[PDB]
PDB file of N, CA and C and ligand atoms in Angstrom:
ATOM      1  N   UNK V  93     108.177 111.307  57.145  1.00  0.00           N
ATOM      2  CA  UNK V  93     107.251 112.221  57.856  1.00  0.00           C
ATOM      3  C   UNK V  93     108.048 113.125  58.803  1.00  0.00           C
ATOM      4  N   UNK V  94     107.612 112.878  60.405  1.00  0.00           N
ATOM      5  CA  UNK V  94     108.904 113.793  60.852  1.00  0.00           C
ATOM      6  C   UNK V  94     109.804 113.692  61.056  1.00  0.00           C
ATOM      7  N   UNK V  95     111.216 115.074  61.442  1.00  0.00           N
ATOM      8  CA  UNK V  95     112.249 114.568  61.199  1.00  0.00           C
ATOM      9  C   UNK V  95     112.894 115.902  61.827  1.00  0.00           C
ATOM     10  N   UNK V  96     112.797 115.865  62.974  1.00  0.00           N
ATOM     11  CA  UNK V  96     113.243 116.530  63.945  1.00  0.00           C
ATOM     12  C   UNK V  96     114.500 116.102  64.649  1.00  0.00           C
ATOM     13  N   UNK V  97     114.958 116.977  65.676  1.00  0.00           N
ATOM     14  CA  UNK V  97     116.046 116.807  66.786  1.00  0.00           C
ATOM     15  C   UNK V  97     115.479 115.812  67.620  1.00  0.00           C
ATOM     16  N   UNK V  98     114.402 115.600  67.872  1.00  0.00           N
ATOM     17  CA  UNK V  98     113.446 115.234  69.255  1.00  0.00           C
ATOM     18  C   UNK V  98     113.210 113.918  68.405  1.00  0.00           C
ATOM     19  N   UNK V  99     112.626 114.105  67.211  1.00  0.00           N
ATOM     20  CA  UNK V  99     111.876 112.726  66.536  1.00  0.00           C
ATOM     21  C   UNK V  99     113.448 111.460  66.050  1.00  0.00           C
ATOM     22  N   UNK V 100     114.410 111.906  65.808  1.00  0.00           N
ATOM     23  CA  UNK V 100     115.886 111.156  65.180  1.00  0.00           C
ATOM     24  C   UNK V 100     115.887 111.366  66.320  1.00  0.00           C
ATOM     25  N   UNK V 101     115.587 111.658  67.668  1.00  0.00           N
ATOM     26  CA  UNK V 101     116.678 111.494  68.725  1.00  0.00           C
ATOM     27  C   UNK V 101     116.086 110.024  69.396  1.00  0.00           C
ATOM     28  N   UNK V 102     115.109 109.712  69.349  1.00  0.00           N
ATOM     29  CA  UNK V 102     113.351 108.857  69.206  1.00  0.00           C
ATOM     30  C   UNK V 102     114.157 107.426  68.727  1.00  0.00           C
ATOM     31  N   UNK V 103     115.096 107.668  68.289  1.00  0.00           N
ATOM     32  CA  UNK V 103     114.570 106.350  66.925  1.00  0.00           C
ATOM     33  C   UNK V 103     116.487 105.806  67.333  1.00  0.00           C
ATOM     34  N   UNK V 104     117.130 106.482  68.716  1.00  0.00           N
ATOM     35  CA  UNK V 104     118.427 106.289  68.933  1.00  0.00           C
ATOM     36  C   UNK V 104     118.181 105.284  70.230  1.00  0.00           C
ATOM     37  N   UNK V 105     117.048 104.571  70.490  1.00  0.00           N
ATOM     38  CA  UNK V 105     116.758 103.907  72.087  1.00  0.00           C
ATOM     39  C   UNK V 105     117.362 102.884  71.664  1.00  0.00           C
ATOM     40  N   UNK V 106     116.923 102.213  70.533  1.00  0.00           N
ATOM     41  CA  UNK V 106     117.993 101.047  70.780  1.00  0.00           C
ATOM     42  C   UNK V 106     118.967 100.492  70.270  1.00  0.00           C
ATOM     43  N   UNK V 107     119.998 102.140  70.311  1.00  0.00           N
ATOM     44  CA  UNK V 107     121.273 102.001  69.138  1.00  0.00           C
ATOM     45  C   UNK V 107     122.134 101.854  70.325  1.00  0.00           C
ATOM     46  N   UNK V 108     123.475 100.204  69.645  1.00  0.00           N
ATOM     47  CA  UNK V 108     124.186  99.805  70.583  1.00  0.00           C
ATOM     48  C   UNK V 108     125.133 100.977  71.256  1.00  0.00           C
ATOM     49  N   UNK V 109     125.316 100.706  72.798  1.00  0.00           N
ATOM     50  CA  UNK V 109     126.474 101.868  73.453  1.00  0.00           C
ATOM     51  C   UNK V 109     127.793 101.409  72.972  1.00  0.00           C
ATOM     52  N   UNK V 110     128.856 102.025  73.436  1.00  0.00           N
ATOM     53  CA  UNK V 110     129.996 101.837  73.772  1.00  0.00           C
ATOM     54  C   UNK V 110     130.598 102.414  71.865  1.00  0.00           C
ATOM     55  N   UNK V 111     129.795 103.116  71.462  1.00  0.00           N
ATOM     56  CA  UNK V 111     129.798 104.127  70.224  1.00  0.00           C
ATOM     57  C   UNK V 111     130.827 105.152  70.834  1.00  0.00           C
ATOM     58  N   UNK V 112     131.499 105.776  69.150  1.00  0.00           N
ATOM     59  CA  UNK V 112     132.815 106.989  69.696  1.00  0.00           C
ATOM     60  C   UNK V 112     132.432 108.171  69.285  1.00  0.00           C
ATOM     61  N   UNK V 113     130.534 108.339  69.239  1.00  0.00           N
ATOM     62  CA  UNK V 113     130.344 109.342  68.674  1.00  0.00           C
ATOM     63  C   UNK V 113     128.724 109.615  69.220  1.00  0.00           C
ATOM     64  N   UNK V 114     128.595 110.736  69.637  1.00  0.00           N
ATOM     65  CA  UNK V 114     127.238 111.457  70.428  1.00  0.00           C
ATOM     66  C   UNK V 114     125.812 111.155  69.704  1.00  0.00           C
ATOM     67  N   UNK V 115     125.008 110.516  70.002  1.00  0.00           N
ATOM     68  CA  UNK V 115     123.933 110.130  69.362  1.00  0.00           C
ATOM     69  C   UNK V 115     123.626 111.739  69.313  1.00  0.00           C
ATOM     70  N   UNK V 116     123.407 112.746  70.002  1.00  0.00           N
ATOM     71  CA  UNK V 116     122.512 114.212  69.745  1.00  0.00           C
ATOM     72  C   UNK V 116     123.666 114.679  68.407  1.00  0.00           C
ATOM     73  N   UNK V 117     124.706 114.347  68.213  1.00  0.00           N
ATOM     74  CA  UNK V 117     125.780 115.218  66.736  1.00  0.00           C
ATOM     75  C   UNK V 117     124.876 114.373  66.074  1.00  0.00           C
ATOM     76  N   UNK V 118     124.662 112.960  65.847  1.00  0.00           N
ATOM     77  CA  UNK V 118     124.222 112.390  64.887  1.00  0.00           C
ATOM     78  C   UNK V 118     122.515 112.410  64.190  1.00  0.00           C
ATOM     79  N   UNK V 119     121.852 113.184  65.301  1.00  0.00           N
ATOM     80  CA  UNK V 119     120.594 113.571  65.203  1.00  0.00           C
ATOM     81  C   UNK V 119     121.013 115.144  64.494  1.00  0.00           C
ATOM     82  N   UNK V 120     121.787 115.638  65.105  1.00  0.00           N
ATOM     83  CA  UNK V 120     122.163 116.968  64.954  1.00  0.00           C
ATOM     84  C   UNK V 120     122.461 117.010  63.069  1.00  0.00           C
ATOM     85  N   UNK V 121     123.466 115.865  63.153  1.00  0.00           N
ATOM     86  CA  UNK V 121     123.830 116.152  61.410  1.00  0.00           C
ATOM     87  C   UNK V 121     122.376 116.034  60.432  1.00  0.00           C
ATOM     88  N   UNK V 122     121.397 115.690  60.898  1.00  0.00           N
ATOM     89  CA  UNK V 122     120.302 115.133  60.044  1.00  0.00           C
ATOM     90  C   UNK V 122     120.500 113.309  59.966  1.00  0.00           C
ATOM     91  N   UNK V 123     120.692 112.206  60.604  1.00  0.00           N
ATOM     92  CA  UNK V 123     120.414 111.166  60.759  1.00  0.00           C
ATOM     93  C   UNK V 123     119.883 110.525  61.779  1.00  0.00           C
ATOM     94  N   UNK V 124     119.663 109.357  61.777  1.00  0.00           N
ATOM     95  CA  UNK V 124     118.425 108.694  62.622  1.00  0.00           C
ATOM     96  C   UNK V 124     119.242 106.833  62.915  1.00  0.00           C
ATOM     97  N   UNK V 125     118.373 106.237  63.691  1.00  0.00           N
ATOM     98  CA  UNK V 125     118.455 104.770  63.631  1.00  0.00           C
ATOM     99  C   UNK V 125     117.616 103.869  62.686  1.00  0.00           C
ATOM    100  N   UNK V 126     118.310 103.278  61.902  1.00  0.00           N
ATOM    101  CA  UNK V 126     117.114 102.420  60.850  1.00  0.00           C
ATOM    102  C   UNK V 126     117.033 101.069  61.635  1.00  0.00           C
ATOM    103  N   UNK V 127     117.727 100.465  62.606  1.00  0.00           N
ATOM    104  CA  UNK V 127     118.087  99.426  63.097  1.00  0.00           C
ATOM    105  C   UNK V 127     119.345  98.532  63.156  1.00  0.00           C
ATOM    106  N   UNK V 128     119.683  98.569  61.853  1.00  0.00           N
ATOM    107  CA  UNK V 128     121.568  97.401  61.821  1.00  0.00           C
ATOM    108  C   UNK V 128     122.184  98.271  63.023  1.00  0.00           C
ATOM    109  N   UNK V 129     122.646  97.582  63.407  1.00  0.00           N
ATOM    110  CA  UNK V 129     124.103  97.860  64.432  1.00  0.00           C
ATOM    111  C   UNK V 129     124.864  98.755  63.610  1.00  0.00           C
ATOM    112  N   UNK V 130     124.952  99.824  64.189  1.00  0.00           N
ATOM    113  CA  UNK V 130     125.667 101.195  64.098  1.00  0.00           C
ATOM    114  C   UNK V 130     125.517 101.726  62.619  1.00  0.00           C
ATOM    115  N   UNK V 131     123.916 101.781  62.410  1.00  0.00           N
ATOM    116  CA  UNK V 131     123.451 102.333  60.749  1.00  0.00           C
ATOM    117  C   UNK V 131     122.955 103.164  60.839  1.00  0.00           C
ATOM    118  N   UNK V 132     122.841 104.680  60.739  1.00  0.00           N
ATOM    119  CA  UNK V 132     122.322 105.587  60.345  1.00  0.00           C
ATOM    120  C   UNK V 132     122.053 105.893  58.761  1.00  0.00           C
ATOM    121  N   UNK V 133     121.426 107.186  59.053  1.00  0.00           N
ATOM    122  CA  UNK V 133     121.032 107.298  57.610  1.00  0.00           C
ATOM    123  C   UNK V 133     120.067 108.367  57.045  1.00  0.00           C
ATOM    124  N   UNK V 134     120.308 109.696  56.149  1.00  0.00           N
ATOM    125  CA  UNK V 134     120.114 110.829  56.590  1.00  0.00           C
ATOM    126  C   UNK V 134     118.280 111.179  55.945  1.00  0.00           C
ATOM    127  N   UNK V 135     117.956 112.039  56.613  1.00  0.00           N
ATOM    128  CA  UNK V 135     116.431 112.161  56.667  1.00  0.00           C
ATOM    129  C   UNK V 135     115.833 112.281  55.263  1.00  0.00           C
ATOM    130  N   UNK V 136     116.860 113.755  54.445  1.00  0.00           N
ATOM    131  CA  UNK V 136     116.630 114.641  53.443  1.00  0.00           C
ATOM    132  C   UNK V 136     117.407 113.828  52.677  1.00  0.00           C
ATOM    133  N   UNK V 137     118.320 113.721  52.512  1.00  0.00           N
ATOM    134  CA  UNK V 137     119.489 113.027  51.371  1.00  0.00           C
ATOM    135  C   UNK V 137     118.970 111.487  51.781  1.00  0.00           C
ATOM    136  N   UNK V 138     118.983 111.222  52.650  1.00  0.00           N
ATOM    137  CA  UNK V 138     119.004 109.600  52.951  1.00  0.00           C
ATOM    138  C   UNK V 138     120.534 108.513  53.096  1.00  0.00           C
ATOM    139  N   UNK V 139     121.284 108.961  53.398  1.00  0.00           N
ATOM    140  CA  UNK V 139     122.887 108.523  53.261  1.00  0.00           C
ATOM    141  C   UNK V 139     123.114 107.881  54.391  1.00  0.00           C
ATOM    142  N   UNK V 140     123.100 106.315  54.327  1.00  0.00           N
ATOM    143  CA  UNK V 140     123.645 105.512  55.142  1.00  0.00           C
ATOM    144  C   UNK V 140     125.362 105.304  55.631  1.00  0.00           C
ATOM    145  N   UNK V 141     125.395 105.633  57.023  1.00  0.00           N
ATOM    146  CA  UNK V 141     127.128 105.717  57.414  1.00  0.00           C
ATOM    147  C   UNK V 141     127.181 104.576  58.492  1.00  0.00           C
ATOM    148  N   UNK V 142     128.332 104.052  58.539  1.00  0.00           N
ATOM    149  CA  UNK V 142     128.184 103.218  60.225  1.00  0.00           C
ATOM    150  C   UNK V 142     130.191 102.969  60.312  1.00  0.00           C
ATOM    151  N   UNK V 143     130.397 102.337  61.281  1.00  0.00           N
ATOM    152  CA  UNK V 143     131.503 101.897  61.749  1.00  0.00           C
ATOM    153  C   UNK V 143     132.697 103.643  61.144  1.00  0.00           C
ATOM    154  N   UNK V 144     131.986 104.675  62.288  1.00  0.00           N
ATOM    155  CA  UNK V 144     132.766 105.683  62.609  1.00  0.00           C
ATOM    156  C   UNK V 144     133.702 105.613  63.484  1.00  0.00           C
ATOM    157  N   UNK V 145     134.895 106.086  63.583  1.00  0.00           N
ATOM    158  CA  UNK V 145     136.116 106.436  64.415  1.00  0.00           C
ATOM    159  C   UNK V 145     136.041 107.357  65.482  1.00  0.00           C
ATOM    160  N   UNK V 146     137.029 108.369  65.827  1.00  0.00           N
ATOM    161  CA  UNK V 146     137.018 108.787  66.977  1.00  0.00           C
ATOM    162  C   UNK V 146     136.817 110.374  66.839  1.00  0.00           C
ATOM    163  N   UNK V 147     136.037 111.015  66.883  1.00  0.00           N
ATOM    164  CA  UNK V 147     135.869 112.299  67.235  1.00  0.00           C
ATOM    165  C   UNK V 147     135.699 112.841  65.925  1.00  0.00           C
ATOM    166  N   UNK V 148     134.944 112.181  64.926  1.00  0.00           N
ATOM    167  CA  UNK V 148     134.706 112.300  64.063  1.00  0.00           C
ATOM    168  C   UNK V 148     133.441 112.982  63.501  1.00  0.00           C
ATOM    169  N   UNK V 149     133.129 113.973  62.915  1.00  0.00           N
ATOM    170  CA  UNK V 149     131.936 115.240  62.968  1.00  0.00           C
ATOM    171  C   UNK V 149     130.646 114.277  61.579  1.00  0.00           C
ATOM    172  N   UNK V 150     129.648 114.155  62.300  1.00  0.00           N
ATOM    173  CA  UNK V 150     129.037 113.650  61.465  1.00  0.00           C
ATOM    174  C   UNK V 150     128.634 114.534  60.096  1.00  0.00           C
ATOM    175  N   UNK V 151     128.190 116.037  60.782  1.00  0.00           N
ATOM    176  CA  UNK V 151     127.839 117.136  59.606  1.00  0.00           C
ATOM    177  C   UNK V 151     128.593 116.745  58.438  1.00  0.00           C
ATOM    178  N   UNK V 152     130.586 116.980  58.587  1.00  0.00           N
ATOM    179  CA  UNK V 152     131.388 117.526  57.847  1.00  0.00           C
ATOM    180  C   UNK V 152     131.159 116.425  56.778  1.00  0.00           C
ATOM    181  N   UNK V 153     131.357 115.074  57.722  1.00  0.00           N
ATOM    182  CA  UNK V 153     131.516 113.859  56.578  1.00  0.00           C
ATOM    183  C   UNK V 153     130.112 114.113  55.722  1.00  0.00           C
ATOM    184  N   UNK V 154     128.582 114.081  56.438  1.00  0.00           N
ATOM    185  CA  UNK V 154     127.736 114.338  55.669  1.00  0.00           C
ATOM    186  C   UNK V 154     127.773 115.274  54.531  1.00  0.00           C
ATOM    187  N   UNK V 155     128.207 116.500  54.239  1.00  0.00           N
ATOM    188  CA  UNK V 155     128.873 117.171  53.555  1.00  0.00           C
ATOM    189  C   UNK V 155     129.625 117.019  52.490  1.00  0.00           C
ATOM    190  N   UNK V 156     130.959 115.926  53.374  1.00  0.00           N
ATOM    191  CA  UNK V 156     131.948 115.985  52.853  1.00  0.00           C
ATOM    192  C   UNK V 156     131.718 114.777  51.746  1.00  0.00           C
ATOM    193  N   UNK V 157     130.481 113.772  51.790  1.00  0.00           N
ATOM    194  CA  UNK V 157     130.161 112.589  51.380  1.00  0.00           C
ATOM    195  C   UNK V 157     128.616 112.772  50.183  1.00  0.00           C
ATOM    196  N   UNK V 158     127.586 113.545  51.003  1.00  0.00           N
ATOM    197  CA  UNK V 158     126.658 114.284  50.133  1.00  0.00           C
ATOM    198  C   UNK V 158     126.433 115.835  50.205  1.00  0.00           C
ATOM    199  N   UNK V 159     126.900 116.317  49.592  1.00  0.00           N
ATOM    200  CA  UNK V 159     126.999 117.810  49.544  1.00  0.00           C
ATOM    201  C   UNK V 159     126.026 118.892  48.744  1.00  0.00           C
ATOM    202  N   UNK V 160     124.643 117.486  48.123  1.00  0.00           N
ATOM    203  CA  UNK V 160     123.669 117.782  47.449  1.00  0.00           C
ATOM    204  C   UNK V 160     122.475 117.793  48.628  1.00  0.00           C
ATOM    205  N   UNK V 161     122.790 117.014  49.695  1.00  0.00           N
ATOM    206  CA  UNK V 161     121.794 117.510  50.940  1.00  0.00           C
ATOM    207  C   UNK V 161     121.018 118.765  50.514  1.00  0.00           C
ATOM    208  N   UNK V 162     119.481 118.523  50.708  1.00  0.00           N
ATOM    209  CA  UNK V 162     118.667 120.108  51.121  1.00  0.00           C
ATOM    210  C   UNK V 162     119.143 120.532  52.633  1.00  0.00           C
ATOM    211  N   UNK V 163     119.145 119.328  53.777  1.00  0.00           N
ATOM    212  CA  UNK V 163     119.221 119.536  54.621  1.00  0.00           C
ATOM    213  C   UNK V 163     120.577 119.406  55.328  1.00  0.00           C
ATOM    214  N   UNK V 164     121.868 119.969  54.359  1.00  0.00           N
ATOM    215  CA  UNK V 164     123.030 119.790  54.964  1.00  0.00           C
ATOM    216  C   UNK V 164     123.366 120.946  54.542  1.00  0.00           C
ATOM    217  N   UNK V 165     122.285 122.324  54.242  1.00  0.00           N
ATOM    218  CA  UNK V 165     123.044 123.440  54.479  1.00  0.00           C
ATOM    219  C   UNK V 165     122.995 124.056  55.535  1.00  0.00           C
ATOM    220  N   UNK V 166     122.311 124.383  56.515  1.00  0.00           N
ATOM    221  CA  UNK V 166     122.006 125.143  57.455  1.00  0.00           C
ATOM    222  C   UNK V 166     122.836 126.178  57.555  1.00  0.00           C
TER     223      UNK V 166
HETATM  224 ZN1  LIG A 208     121.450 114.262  54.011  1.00  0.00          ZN
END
């Protein structure tokens, strides 16, 4: 249903801290919290990622991983 900046940003309350990567990039790339410890997973494509590194761009990998995204062209 929705699947906004505001609504994926919603669904980041009780994603663990001490993460190396901005919950708003990860709303930003098109993903959300499904619940597991550090699981996202994209709205339009649906592509589950977790145990990211350091300064690492969620878009590119989204991209760089599903590149059939509707919602990874902007
Ligand atoms: Zn996607």
């Amino acid at each position: 249903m929705l699947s906004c900046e505001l609504y994926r940003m919603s669904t980041y309350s009780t994603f663990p801290a001490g993460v190396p990567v901005s919950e708003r990039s990860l709303a930003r790339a098109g993903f959300y919290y499904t619940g597991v410890n550090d699981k996202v997973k994209c709205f339009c494509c649906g592509l589950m990622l977790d145990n990211w590194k350091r300064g690492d761009s969620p878009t590119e990998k989204h991209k760089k991983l599903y590149p059939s995204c509707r919602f990874v062209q902007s």
